[PDB]
Amino acid sequence: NRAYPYTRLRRNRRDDFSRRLVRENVLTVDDLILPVFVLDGVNQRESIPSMPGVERLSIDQLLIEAEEWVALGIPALALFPVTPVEKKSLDAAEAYNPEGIAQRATRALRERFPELGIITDVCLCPFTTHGQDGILDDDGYVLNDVSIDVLVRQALSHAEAGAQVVAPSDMMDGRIGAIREALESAGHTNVRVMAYSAKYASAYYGPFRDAVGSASNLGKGNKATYQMDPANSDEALHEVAADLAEGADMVMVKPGMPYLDIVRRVKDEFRAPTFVYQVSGEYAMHMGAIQNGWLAESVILESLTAFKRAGADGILTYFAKQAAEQLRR
Amino acid sequence: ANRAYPYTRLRRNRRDDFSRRLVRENVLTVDDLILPVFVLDGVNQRESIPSMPGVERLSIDQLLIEAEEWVALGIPALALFPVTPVEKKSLDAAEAYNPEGIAQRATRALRERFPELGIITDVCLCPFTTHGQDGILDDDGYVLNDVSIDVLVRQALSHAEAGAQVVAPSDMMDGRIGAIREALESAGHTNVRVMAYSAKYASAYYGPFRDAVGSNKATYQMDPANSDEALHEVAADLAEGADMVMVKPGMPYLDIVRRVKDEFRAPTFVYQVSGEYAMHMGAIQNGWLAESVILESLTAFKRAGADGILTYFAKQAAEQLRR
Amino acid sequence: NRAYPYTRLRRNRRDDFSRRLVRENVLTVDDLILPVFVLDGVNQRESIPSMPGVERLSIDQLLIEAEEWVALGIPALALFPVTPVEKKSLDAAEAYNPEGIAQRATRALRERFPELGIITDVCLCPFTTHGQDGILDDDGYVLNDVSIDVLVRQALSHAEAGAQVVAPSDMMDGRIGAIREALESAGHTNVRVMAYSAKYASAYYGPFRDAVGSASNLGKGNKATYQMDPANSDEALHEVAADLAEGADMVMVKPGMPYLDIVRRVKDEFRAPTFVYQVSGEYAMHMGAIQNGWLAESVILESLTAFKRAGADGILTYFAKQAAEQLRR
Amino acid sequence: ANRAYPYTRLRRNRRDDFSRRLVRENVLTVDDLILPVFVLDGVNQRESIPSMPGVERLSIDQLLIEAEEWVALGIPALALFPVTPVEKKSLDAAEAYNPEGIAQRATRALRERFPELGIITDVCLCPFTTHGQDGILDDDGYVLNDVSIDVLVRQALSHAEAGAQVVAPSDMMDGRIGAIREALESAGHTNVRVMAYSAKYASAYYGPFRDAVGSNKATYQMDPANSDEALHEVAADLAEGADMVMVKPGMPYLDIVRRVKDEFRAPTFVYQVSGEYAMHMGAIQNGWLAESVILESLTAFKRAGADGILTYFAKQAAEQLRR
Amino acid sequence: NRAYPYTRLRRNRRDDFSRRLVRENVLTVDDLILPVFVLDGVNQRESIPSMPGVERLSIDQLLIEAEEWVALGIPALALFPVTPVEKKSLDAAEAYNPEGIAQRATRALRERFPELGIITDVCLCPFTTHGQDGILDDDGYVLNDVSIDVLVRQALSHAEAGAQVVAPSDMMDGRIGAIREALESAGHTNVRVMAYSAKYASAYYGPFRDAVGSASNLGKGNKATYQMDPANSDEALHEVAADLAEGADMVMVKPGMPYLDIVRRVKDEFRAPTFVYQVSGEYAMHMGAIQNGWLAESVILESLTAFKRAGADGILTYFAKQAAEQLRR
Amino acid sequence: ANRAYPYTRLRRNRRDDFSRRLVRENVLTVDDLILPVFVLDGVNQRESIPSMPGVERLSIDQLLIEAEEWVALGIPALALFPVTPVEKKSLDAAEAYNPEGIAQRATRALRERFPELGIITDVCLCPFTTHGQDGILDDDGYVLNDVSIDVLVRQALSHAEAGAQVVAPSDMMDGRIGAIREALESAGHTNVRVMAYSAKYASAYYGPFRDAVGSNKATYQMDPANSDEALHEVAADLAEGADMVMVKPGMPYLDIVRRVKDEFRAPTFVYQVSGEYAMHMGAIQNGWLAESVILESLTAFKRAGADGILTYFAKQAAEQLRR
Ligand SMILES: [K+]
Ligand SMILES: [K+]
Ligand SMILES: [K+]
Ligand SMILES: [K+]
Ligand SMILES: [K+]
Ligand SMILES: [K+]
Ligand SMILES: [Mg+2]
Ligand SMILES: [Mg+2]
Ligand SMILES: [Mg+2]
Ligand SMILES: [Mg+2]
Ligand SMILES: [Mg+2]
Ligand SMILES: [Mg+2]
Ligand SMILES: [Mg+2]
Ligand SMILES: [Mg+2]
Ligand SMILES: [Mg+2]
Ligand SMILES: [Zn+2]
Ligand SMILES: [Zn+2]
Ligand SMILES: [Zn+2]
Ligand SMILES: [Zn+2]
Ligand SMILES: [Zn+2]
Ligand SMILES: [Zn+2]
């Protein structure tokens, strides 16, 4: 029965102190995960034109930059390997190569910064000649269960490299359970599985496909037989329920700001650790506008606060370092 | 319901276009689209807006030309924003209720020429104040609530008199929806709808609009951190007589859309603001994102529970939907 | 606290534009599934007096008519074979004959129109001399588990013919799970199962039994030991929960408009892909009245909009072509 | 969601600090903290309080000195409690609305010297009555509801006149929130917040506060047994116009905090009272518990759903948070 | 629509009789469980300075004191053994010694007071040289499944001694199910399992670690890799759901008053028998203040009533005897 | 929570008395009990009631004697029902508001002699009308709603004047709770509680009460078939100002108790009526049921969610609870 003018919702807005007292959500560095593009070789740094301010880094250069990310208190990195073209194959075998970029990077980081979380990507897209997330059948369809067998080997390779978290981004049915079963049978009892549970067939990924180098491979291909239809919301709840049942320790929605309603429903429905990925296209859009002088740089912390408000526990964001820097002040 | 792999494989419905179509939960249609327009003072004039690539400010005659195409595409309504000449701004904002102000003129012209097209006028003082704030300022520089409302009510009445089917208070004063509703009923404007901007945030995403209309607000616009508060905003506005309620900005607040729809089951609108437009269009023009993101962003609003979307993409989208 | 005259619910009704903006549901062609009665032979077309405007078609004639249904954007057909009397048996073996009408029709359509969805009917009613949905015991009771064995063979035959969806309409307990288990073990991983979950023992089916030719066989028989009591609503939720658990990809209520409350409860409770069948008797009633001049032809789109409003994702309707034609304008 | 060991091992997230940090559901920040202060009548005076180790009563000048450190640490607000000289107590409690009473003086001094610091004044008669009860007594010794409210309204207005941004009625009279709100609106104090002590229990945990301010209540304060009743208290106070609602005591009533937050989704505060403070500080000083319990107790309030916490630990906590 | 002055919530508060009629919760002796620290040897009584008024008792002295606890109607005791330093080991074997303090005490009490409930503690902390709750790996981490094997042997030893309830306080994943499986396979069909489901990594346990003598062993060690983060609430619901599924007969939150919100959520969500432990630090805080004259002795019954109000069925409290004495008046 | 045999055996908690006690969800205490009394007009008089074995009508002096034992047993309150002499009945029911009527006399006597004992008076015209209906009849023999309320308000005021702490309108007129509340507030009886008989059914279980007090109602009392309707009854009575709400009869309506408690979370009472009493006591006296059914029936009310129970078994139960 709250009614004007007895209730004037502006009164708590009148002064900073009161806005602060009633403020419902804050972003902190504990919320931030920095995705990073990792090159083969030594002394390599490459600018990504469709992600201004983000560079692909060789492992030695990654280790250097990580000193500052650690000093800033960023909890974890999410690694994405930029696989050399010649190491792409129909069988995606590079995915489980102990000498692959992801596995070498993991080992290096785990030794140099033992408290830093490493989240590896479980997916065949960086490894396939066609750029799809799994292995194709003779009709060009991404086979579910055959792909899982490769994903499982990948995941085990990561666990062997020391990754504390593996994050299946492939959208095969059942892969969370298969990976978990494998990790448990192998003794990797504490390796976390951060499921990409509600990952949509989105247009917002374009820049990442450029950054990881799968854009050329995929071409005009689409992922609608596995990634989710943008139109669907209830379906996301079913996706997440399965992944929880299958043993996921964290569940993720991707992309991010275009899907904040999904973040809210998922958090509300399951009350489980919920993550969101602020994808390459989101980062690019924001950067492009800030660089043009169309949006103030305050939009970065507004965008990230939105995720907290919607119910995410953690955010994968290419803004993680700038945000951590702003928070540190 | 104990759904478990492999008895349940959620990919099966995704296998084919036909089954994707059958199960698709939401669709965007032209019926969902409302186009905001920036309206100039002369004749035979258009102006480009540096921070909104592709959007033109339009004099009324130009508006009427373009509206023929908008109506033909089935866009149901426009939301008008006047670009007030500097010389007509004042501390009292009286131009807001001038019967020959741009908004009022534009409205009468449109109502006569396209009687089926909905016209949503903006009730707010920000295009009219020397200072660009949304209400009348006190000596400390604070936006005065109830004094501002008196101006707003006069504005809204002038819009009604001009023929506006919908007035949309975007000012975020407390209690303004009720005051406006009371004045419209008392004047006999029994069917003029009020589209409340109920949960309007103190956002950085509005920068380009200020460039567009030619016009610090944390004492009235909402803290981006706050979600529960939006439900209290909305509840008051429904009780006060709003016919529709709106969340602004849009994409950055899709969670609020969903909560608002779910809690009240009332006609719910969302504003895809100038900065959302600009970042999308900038990225598409830079070749960084595909054109397809336009419809993906609009489908998100529908999925989140919006009934209608105020969007600078309305004509592009309507075109895409007609193909 | 909404109260007159502050709140006048007529204001949004005042003008078309505002009614359009606030309109809660729309029907689109993406919602439509056309059931079709399929004859043996060549060059055969037969009018059904109790379903005015609907014809039984031989496969060649079906293929011709399907060009227009495809051009209209109708997503799928649901096939119902008109089995020759001489091919009815106690064992219902025709149900799994690779040369049966349903299996031949499926193969023909899958080749001619590869994007068109084909939903086959899994049920023994077109195949039994007695017109019941399963195999009878020596007391005249429809045996549950023995019937499932035949249903399973049927379903596999359909999958082998290329059907993208099989739709068990039999109301045996457990058949969704048994069919799913069979499809999975045989490698038909992506064959959808559209369960008739809440199918009631209704009087509204009379015309269909005429159209498929099971009316004579069933006679005065009833299906109350398997189809649901019209009086029961909570029971429908239990029926649907089982079918979801058993692996259904879609769940259906039948009949349709007489059961819209069930559609609403099912959608609300499970948030799963929900379908509704506007049965023969519903079509006949409406057609009869329109032909008499008692109801305007606008009732067709009103009837279909009701299903959307009640929460159905898709509608099996003999009006699918007229509706698609009206929508296309 | 059918989570089952060993597919689900809830220890995995606990394995490492980084994953503990990622999933941690609540954090305390300085923004959550409100420091209650006991304010004396002279100059250059502090007094120690036997039952609140480490808390000093402060004359206004001393308050202003300490407030520089409080503001520097980012504490958003103070809640003032005057220590009335015995000679100013009376049966009518008139000192409550004296414009040169301690609270009023302290407020004007603070508002001038630290304009951004929030000042929460106490609306209650207990520091002012010869008898120490929270309202005016009838011949049977019963606290009179509506008579007491009239005094309270005059008090609240005097605080508003002194510049208080928030008045916090702690009296537990029925209907006082509405009466105060009505009087503030009618006087033009449109933005003075009211922080209702909505669910305030008849508790043994207040003993040390009475020692601190220098001041049997089961006919107005709530029965500790009752939970549902708290929701009815809160609902009335929201309807009456409260901007914030409070549960007191705190830790012993964390269930009430949670229910109150969950039911109303409104700005919810909690008072970690003098006895909670004393038992913690006594135990820490006795070496029986680690200092870490301070932040653990404060994190509990956040977890339970409180937006802000009135706590004598606010400065210690703010210090810990700044390291 | 309740509004002043039609509704004045003070009216039921006006008189004792009406406060009594509407009083929502009462504490009774049926709610009380007394934890007790048990020494080896004969004729031993030891005061605990950080728990004023509580003594560690040898078994003969326990039996004497139990006469009064039984006369007061206290339903159950929770036993905590003060293990001799020399009987601590890396393998925690003393935990399952049939001649251990807990097992001897159980047997003695079960014979002397057959109606008195005995709740034994299942945990390795009193038995390990390092004071952690399980067995450590070579990185110093408490191994989950190896620890469960020892916990299981412990639990079986208690059941063999006659304990009616075993209470696992160890916070290993899955231990409820493993213990239950063991009890059932051994024929201990009616031995209750009182799970410590939501046991937090708290500072409030200090005095107990002194009383049981594990303080020296643990040193500065922490239990954050198994006990719950104080910040987390939703996580508690997941913890309890697992333990119910695994067969717990009662579920517990620990500590107590600092976690009353958890008690409320757990009771509300599961409607199962819910217990709360008013830990050593809570008892000490209260006692310290009462002894200083800072709080009246009425705080004891206020503190206990809080637990009832929050939804607990039973309370483990070192105040159980004083409270029972006050209630008996 | 996937509890399944044999991991879950619900018998384990049942194995032993101690664990049965630990998990027992509800307990009856003396605090739950309210004893209804039938009060006669002379002196040194008691009468037995044929259809209520063991219950006596008591003159006031006898009431006072017995009340010493009731108070000693801790019974919190009595509910008085006067046995009006035939000569004082009338079509206007004026005896209802006679200051020297039985109820009023009994109340003053009790309030003086046992000031802590709660006195609940009956507001209803049925003991006062020549015809025994609960209100004033029109020419068609219909119980007039608003006319009856005027009498009821005068009655209630007379009870307040006599010292009653609680008035309990049992008449089932629409809107009477509000009318009574308004009149009590307007007269200054600010703390007189109103215990609404909110969901009072047109039941066959009342037969023996009519024998007891010496006093067709389907146009005002509720249809036993109806459950949802009870929630609407209760909601109105809370909004109207009831302090407590009651369901009558009791056992035959335990579902209503539970729904009422669950929906409103307000102080909820239940009447174990004369016919419930009689069938139990008759069966116990016939040797067909054990005495234990008394406490089992009372525990049911607590389990169903009642805060207090009006019961002719209150003294027996209190005695059993004291052993
Ligand atoms: K977080
Ligand atoms: K719409
Ligand atoms: K659809
Ligand atoms: K806060
Ligand atoms: K209990
Ligand atoms: K009670
Ligand atoms: Mg999935
Ligand atoms: Mg021109
Ligand atoms: Mg508002
Ligand atoms: Mg079924
Ligand atoms: Mg000085
Ligand atoms: Mg109150
Ligand atoms: Mg656990
Ligand atoms: Mg005598
Ligand atoms: Mg009524
Ligand atoms: Zn991938
Ligand atoms: Zn504006
Ligand atoms: Zn059939
Ligand atoms: Zn006070
Ligand atoms: Zn332990
Ligand atoms: Zn009566």
Curated annotation (Swiss-Prot), chains A, C, E:
Coiled coil (UniProt feature): none
Active site residues according to the UniProt entry: K199, K254
Enzyme class: lyase
GO molecular function, one term: zinc ion binding
EC number(s) recorded for this UniProt protein: 4.2.1.24
Sequence positions that bind 5-aminolevulinate 2: S280, Y318
Residue positions binding Mg(2+): E239
Mechanisms controlling activity: Stimulated by magnesium ions.
Cofactor(s) required, per the database record: Mg(2+)
InterPro entries given in the database record: ALAD, ALAD_AS, Aldolase_TIM
Residues bound to 5-aminolevulinate 1: R209, K223
Family annotation (SUPFAM superfamilies): Aldolase
Alphabetized UniProt keyword annotations: Heme biosynthesis, Lyase, Magnesium, Metal-binding, Porphyrin biosynthesis
Signal peptide range in chain numbering: none
UniProt-listed PROSITE patterns: D_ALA_DEHYDRATASE
Family, per entry: Belongs to the ALAD family.
NCBIfam families in alphabetical order: PRK09283.1 (NF006762)
Assembly behavior: Homooctamer; formed by oligomerization of dimers.
Function comment: Catalyzes an early step in the biosynthesis of tetrapyrroles. Binds two molecules of 5-aminolevulinate per subunit, each at a distinct site, and catalyzes their condensation to form porphobilinogen.
Protein name as it appears in the record: Delta-aminolevulinic acid dehydratase
